[PDB]
């Protein structure tokens, strides 16, 4: 798993 950006990942 990983992130594109941060909004979805950090919420």
């Amino acid at each position, epitope marked *: *798993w*990983g*992130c*594109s*950006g*941060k*909004l*979805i*990942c950090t*919420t």
Partner: antibody
Framework: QVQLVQSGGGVFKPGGSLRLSCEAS????????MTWVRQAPGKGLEWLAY????????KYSPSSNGRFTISRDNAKNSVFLQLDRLSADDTAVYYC???????????????????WGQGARVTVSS | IVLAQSPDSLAVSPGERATIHCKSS???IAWYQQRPGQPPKLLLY???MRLSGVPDRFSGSGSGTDFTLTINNLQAEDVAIYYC?????????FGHGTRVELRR
């Protein structure tokens, strides 16, 4: 300022092809998957494609059938959309949009479009 | 996976309350604002979380299958088309939108 500026719209004869450009600034480009979304006059929003951070992996709407190619140039902070075999149905406004979401390997998941270009108008007519 | 959005159009007086609904066939919901001749702008995601900069009068809610966008103290700059977005389905889908006009 965090923005995406597009260019490359215009009027086109059918049967040919076009490329649209989008230039990103104000944020770290390689941290985001980029996408294209189009909106036909009157209709709603249709997601077209996404491209991964390193510009190597791209996914398309089931209705694309290979006609669309999204690509990116990280050194130039730019994303592109090429569209072949143009027809009148391709007449629409095309948006460049930044995607914030999860990735699972190269697959983009749970994504929202948090930043949008100003759009490019495309008209296809004989 | 469809998104029935309603009502299609909605007349509201300034200062009053606008209420937009979004139902899916099956909380990954996002709301977008598009003013005439303008690109879409993200307002809410996870159904209820406003993006930074979006005024407090915009609020989202929704239990499971039905979702609501609420605009309180309606302003003139709020006249736009609003789109709900389901981002847990493949591919992602949008509603056909809801026009918010002024009431006279």
């Amino acid at each position: 300022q965090v923005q995406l500026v597009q260019s490359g719209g215009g009027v086109f004869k059918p049967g040919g092809s076009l490329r649209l450009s989008c230039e990103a600034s104000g944020f770290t480009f390689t941290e985001y998957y980029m996408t294209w979304v189009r909106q036909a006059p009157g209709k709603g929003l249709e997601w077209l494609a996404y491209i991964s951070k390193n510009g190597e992996y791209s996914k398309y709407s089931p209705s694309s059938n290979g006609r669309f190619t999204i690509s990116r140039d990280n050194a130039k902070n730019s994303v592109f959309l090429q569209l072949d075999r143009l027809s009148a149905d391709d007449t629409a406004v095309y948006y460049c949009a930044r995607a914030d979401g999860l990735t699972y390997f190269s697959e983009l998941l749970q994504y929202i479009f948090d930043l949008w270009g100003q759009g490019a108008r495309v008209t296809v007519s004989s | 996976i469809v998104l029935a959005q309603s009502p299609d159009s909605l007349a509201v007086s300034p200062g009053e309350r606008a209420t937009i609904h979004c139902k899916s066939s099956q909380h990954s919901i996002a709301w977008y604002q598009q003013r005439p001749g303008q690109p879409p702008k993200l307002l809410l995601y996870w159904a209820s979380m406003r993006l930074s900069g979006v005024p407090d009068r915009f609020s989202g809610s929704g239990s499971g299958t039905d979702f609501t966008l609420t605009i309180n103290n309606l302003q003139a700059e709020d006249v736009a088309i609003y789109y709900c977005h389901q981002y847990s389905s493949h591919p992602p889908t949008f509603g056909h939108g809801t026009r918010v006009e002024l009431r006279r």
